[PDB]
Amino acid sequence: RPTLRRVRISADAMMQALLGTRAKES
Amino acid sequence: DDIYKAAVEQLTEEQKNEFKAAFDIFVLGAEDGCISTKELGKVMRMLGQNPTPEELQEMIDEVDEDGSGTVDFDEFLVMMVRCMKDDSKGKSEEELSDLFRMFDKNADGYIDLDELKMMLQATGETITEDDIEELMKDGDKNNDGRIDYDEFLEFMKGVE
Amino acid sequence: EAEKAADESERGMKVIESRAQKDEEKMEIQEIQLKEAKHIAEDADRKYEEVARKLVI
Amino acid sequence: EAEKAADESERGMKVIESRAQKDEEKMEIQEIQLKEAKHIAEDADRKYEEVARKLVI
Amino acid sequence: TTALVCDNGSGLVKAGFAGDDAPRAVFPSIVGRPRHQGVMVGMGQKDSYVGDEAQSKRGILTLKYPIEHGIITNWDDMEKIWHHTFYNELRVAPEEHPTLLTEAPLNPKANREKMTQIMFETFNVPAMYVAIQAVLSLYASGRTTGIVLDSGDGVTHNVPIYEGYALPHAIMRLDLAGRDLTDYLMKILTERGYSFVTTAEREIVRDIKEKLCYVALDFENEMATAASSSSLEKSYELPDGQVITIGNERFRCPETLFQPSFIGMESAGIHETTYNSIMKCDIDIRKDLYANNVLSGGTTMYPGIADRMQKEITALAPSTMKIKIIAPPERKYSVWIGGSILASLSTFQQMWISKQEYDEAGPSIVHRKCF
Ligand SMILES: Nc1ncnc2c1ncn2[C@@H]1O[C@H](COP(=O)(O)OP(=O)(O)O)[C@@H](O)[C@H]1O
Ligand SMILES: [Ca+2]
Ligand SMILES: [Mg+2]
């Protein structure tokens, strides 16, 4: 039985969400 | 896996220095000099993404073979690019299965390494006998002297 | 009028300074306990992982 | 003279009260984080003890 | 496209796209109208707060669950809950996504037919399929046999399965579940002085039950110990202060599961309805069911239940058989993980109830071949 993951959302979006306002270049 | 190793080998010092600066900016104040499994998971939860701690353990086992839970530069970039899993579905299954079945030109149910040798001669990529030997070891799990069809699925599993 | 205003200003400054020092102490102790708890959590997670692997074996 | 003194005291009082209120809010956030850390620590401790007992059995 | 694996449940609605590990949005299923008058003008006060929003304004609301025991008693509120789930917690219009609801065994037909009629007429989904809540929990464990005890919050049901062939004559559905345990805990707390009456304070009692209660390995010894020492009294801080101390109410609340005579129910506990469900099966598959007993559902998360249940069944069962109780750490979302796995299968892709089929046979299509 294979497993599918949608938890791994786009990594650029993850970087943006973490850096918050300071997410300007990354 | 080594897929991300190939992806970062495709990448250059631009990505290296970009992620180095990202470390300097966000991991600033951390006493680690790397990124830990727990630190990465907690930071992800802080931003909103909530992967499982079992995924943290899996990723740390993958990139950090020593089990330290940290990320050496190469394995650090591998772990960082592991988050964005754009390429999935591993190419095609049945058509590639037919290609591998016809690869057994002798049609004995056995894939000789010399057929692989001829096909690689066609490819001509920079490879020595030890390199193809190591690749077959990665493929010939049961060490039956051939490329097993189930092992053909295994080594091409997820491979685009 | 000025006398009354000065008295009220002095009292307000006193109470605000007291509350500010209380807040600084609370922030310091909160940070200390927070860091200690996070380290304990890391230790517990590591122990859990190790014992789980041994249990599977 | 008294008017000038009163106005200066008023401005100092307002700015110090504002800074105290902001630091108090951040202290409340820190306390919330500490509570979450406490919960995580307790849950992980229960995990570890349960797994160890099962391994012994 | 991707399928929507919704799971109505009773107490927590769990939803998310098919193929993931955990539900995307989990929130209580309560709809609470305000009850006081309201004097501020222009505050933007709505007429009904649903989902997790009504767990923050619960001080001035009258929360009421739209699902009593598996069955749905208030269809307008359930429609509101579904609308919220689709549009605000997932933000995907249902016009472009198949749905996979879940339903308890032995439920009234009209409930299921109304559910499919709503999904096809109001939300206008492309295709929906209804699955029994226990088969999914068996999917998630990666087994293919085993008898699964899915003690949810509404209803506890016990479906035995062998080699993929369900045994319809051995399903034992019992209506004791988490909600009755909450009510019984709220009723025995009054023996110390703490009175919780309002429908909002039921949530506080639920939190007490989740955080403090545990299942005793042996009931009489615990009752004797708690009556002599004071090593059990754990305290808890209400939403306003005034900490409370729970004594032997800790293991008496979840003990109702194994002795339903506490809340006046006649039937036998969850330790004996499993053995009865096994004994109704054929004589040759009892060993496999004994060895693969599966736990699921929220209420089976009490600390120390996987040992009490094993001790009880070992007492009942023959001495030679091995009794093993599968209690995965991801118990709460086991049904939804199984639902995701089932919706992600290629073999299952032609079992959906397509809309044209519903247009030709009406809502009674669900009882037909497309089960
Ligand atoms: N950690 C826990 N410990 C004890 N009881 C719990 C815990 N989590 C949930 N519960 C109980 O289980 C119920 C949730 O059950 P759930 O599986 O969500 O029901 P459903 O099958 O309707 O989804 C809650 O009402 C609560 O009483
Ligand atoms: Ca060959
Ligand atoms: Mg359920």
Question: In the 3-class helix/strand/coil scheme, how is C1-57 assigned residue by residue?
Answer: CHHHHHHHHHHHHHHHHHHHHHHHHHHHHHHHHHHHHHHHHHHHHHHHHHHHHHHHC
Residue at E131: amino acid letter: A
Tokens of E194: 């703490």
Closest of E191, E193, E179, E185 to residue E214, by C-alpha: E185
Which atom of ligand 1 has the smallest separation from the CA of E178?
27
Return the structure tokens found at E244: 């409370």
Task: Tell me the C-alpha to C-alpha distance, in Å, between residue D19 and each of C5, D8, D26, E271.
Answer: 22, 17, 11, 60
**Contact present, B103 and B115 (Cβ < 8 Å):** yes
For residue B62, give the H/E element and its range: helix B53-63
**DSSP classification of residue D29:** H
B144 is in an annotated binding site: yes
Structure tokens at B120: 């690689």
The alpha carbon dihedral of B129, B133, B134, B139 has a sign of positive
Q: Do A5 and E344 touch (CB under 8 A)?
A: no
Q: d(Cα C6, Cα E85) in Å, to the nearest integer?
A: 58
**Contact present, E284 and E322 (Cβ < 8 Å):** no
Distance CA E163, CA E305 (A): 27
For residue E10, which atom of ligand 1 is closest to its CA? Answer: 22
Q: How many angstroms separate the Cα of C20 from the Cα of each of C9, C28, D24, E9? A: 16, 12, 8, 49
Ligand 1 contact, E265 CB (< 6 A): no
The Cα E151–Cα E257 span in angstroms is: 10
Amino acid at E20: D
Rounded to whole angstroms, the Cα distance separating E285 from E163 reads: 10
CB contact under 8 A, B51 and A8: yes
| Cross-strand bridge partners of residue E172 | E158
How close is the Cα of B88 to the center of ligand 2, in Å?
A: 29
State phi, psi for B41 to the nearest 5 degrees: -65, -45
Ligand found nearest the CA of B103 = 2
Give the mutation target among E210, E212, E295 for probing the ligand 1 site: most ligand atoms within 8 A of CB: E210
- Nearest Cα to Cα of residue B140 among B120, B121, B112: B112
Q: Which two tokens stand for residue E13?
A: 């609605």
From B118, B121, B149, B156, select the one nearest B135 (Cα to Cα): B156
Between CA B67 and CA B61 the distance in angstroms is 6
Please indicate if any CB of chain C lies within 8 Å of the CB of B105. Answer: no
Residue B64, class by beta-carbon neighbours within 10 Å (0-12 exposed, 13-18 middle, 19+ buried)?
buried
Q: Within 10 Å of residue D29's Cβ, how many Cβ atoms? A: 11
Q: Does B12 touch chain E (CB under 8 A)?
A: no
CB E216, CB E304: distance < 8 Å: yes
Cβ contact E170:E146 at 8 Å = no
Task: In whole angstroms, give the CA distance from residue E25 to residue E13.
Answer: 8
Going from the C-alpha of E299 to that of each of A11, E276, E279, the distances in angstroms are 36, 21, 24
Closest of E75, E71, E67 to residue E30, by C-alpha: E67
Compute, in degrees rounded to 10, the torsion defined by CA atoms E166, E288, E171, E150.
-100
Q: Give me the torsion for CA of B103, B106, B109, B110, rounded to 10°.
A: -80
Among E312, E292, E36, residue whose Cα is nearest residue E143:
E292
Query: In this structure, how many other beta carbons lie within 10 angstroms of the beta carbon of residue E337?
Result: 24
Is E212 a pocket residue for ligand 1 (Cβ < 6 Å)? no
- Backbone region of residue E312 per phi and psi (left: phi > 0; alpha: psi in -120 to 50; beta: other values): alpha
E31-34/E25-27 β-pairing? unpaired
From the CA of E331, the nearest ligand is 1
The alpha carbon of B116 and the centre of ligand 2 are apart by a number of angstroms equal to 9
Which of helix, strand or coil describes residue B160? coil
- Token readout for E21 is 């590990």
- In angstroms, the first-to-last Cα distance of chain B is 13
Q: Find the Cα–Cα–Cα–Cα dihedral E123, E129, E130, E136, rounded to 10°.
A: -120
Judged by DSSP in three states, B65 sits in coil
| Residue in B closest to C49 by C-alpha | B57
E311/E305 Cα distance (integer angstroms): 10
Q: What is the CA radius of gyration of chain A?
A: 13
Query: Which tokens in the block code for residue E111?
Result: 């409930």
Asked whether the beta carbons of E34 and E10 are under 8 A apart, the reply is no
- B128 Cα–ligand 2 center, Å: 21
Q: Going by CA atoms, what residue is nearest to atom 17 of ligand 1?
A: E298
Q: Which fold has domain E4-137+333-360?
A: Nucleotidyltransferase; domain 5 (3.30.420)
Tell me whether residues A5 and B48 touch, CB distance under 8 A. Answer: no
Residue to mutate, E301, E333, E335, E336, ligand 1, most ligand atoms under 8 Å from C-beta = E301
Structure tokens at C21: 């020092």
Q: Whose CA is nearest to atom 21 of ligand 1?
A: E152
CB pair distance less than 8 Å for B38 and C45: yes
The answer to whether the CB atoms of A18 and B47 lie below 8 A apart is yes
Return the closest-CA partner of residue D25 out of E252, E196, C30, A4: C30
What number does the ligand 1 atom closest to the CA of E12 have? 18
- How many whole angstroms from E308 Cα to the centroid of ligand 1? 19
Q: What angle do CA D45, D50, D55 make, to 5 degrees?
A: 125
Inter-residue contact E160 to E289 (CB < 8 Å): yes
Count how many Cα atoms sit within 13 Å of the Cα of residue E284 in the half-sphere of its side chain: 1
* Region label for E85, one of left (φ > 0), alpha (ψ between -120 and 50) or beta (otherwise): alpha
The Cα–Cα gap between B107 and B86 comes to 36
Gap between the Cα atoms of B138 and E156, Å rounded: 49
Cα separation, B78 vs B75, whole angstroms: 5
Q: Which residue of C has its CA nearest to D32?
A: C30
Interacting residues of E46 by C-beta distance below 8 A, sequence separation 6+: none
Q: Which residue has the tokens 């069944």?
A: E313
- Residue E292 in tokens: 């693969």
Alpha helices (H) along chain E: 75-84, 109-121, 133-140, 178-188, 201-212, 219-226, 249-252, 270-279, 286-291, 305-316, 334-343, 355-361
In a 3-state reduction of DSSP, which class is residue B6? helix
Most A-contacting residue of B14, B17, B47 (CB-CB within 10 A), to test interface: B47
Of B29, B160, B13, residue with least CA distance to B88: B160
8-state DSSP, E59: G
Q: What is the DSSP string of D3-56?
A: HHHHHHHHHHHHHHHHHHHHHHHHHHHHHHHHHHHHHHHHHHHHHHHHHHHHHH
**Burial annotation C10-24 (CB, 10 A radius, 16+ → b, else e):** eebbeebeebbeebe
Q: Closest Cα to residue E202, out of E224, E225, E219, E183?
A: E183
Give the mutation candidate from E341, E342, E346, E348 for the A interface (greatest A CB count, under 10 A). Answer: E341
Four-CA torsion E167, E173, E177, E179, nearest 10 degrees? 130
Architecture of domain E178-256: Alpha-Beta Complex (3.90)
* Alpha-carbon span E30 to E194, nearest angstrom: 25
CA of B3 to the centre of ligand 2 (A): 27
Q: Give CA–CA dist E195/E187, Å, rounded.
A: 8
B82 is in an annotated binding site: no
Range list of H helices, chain A: 11-19
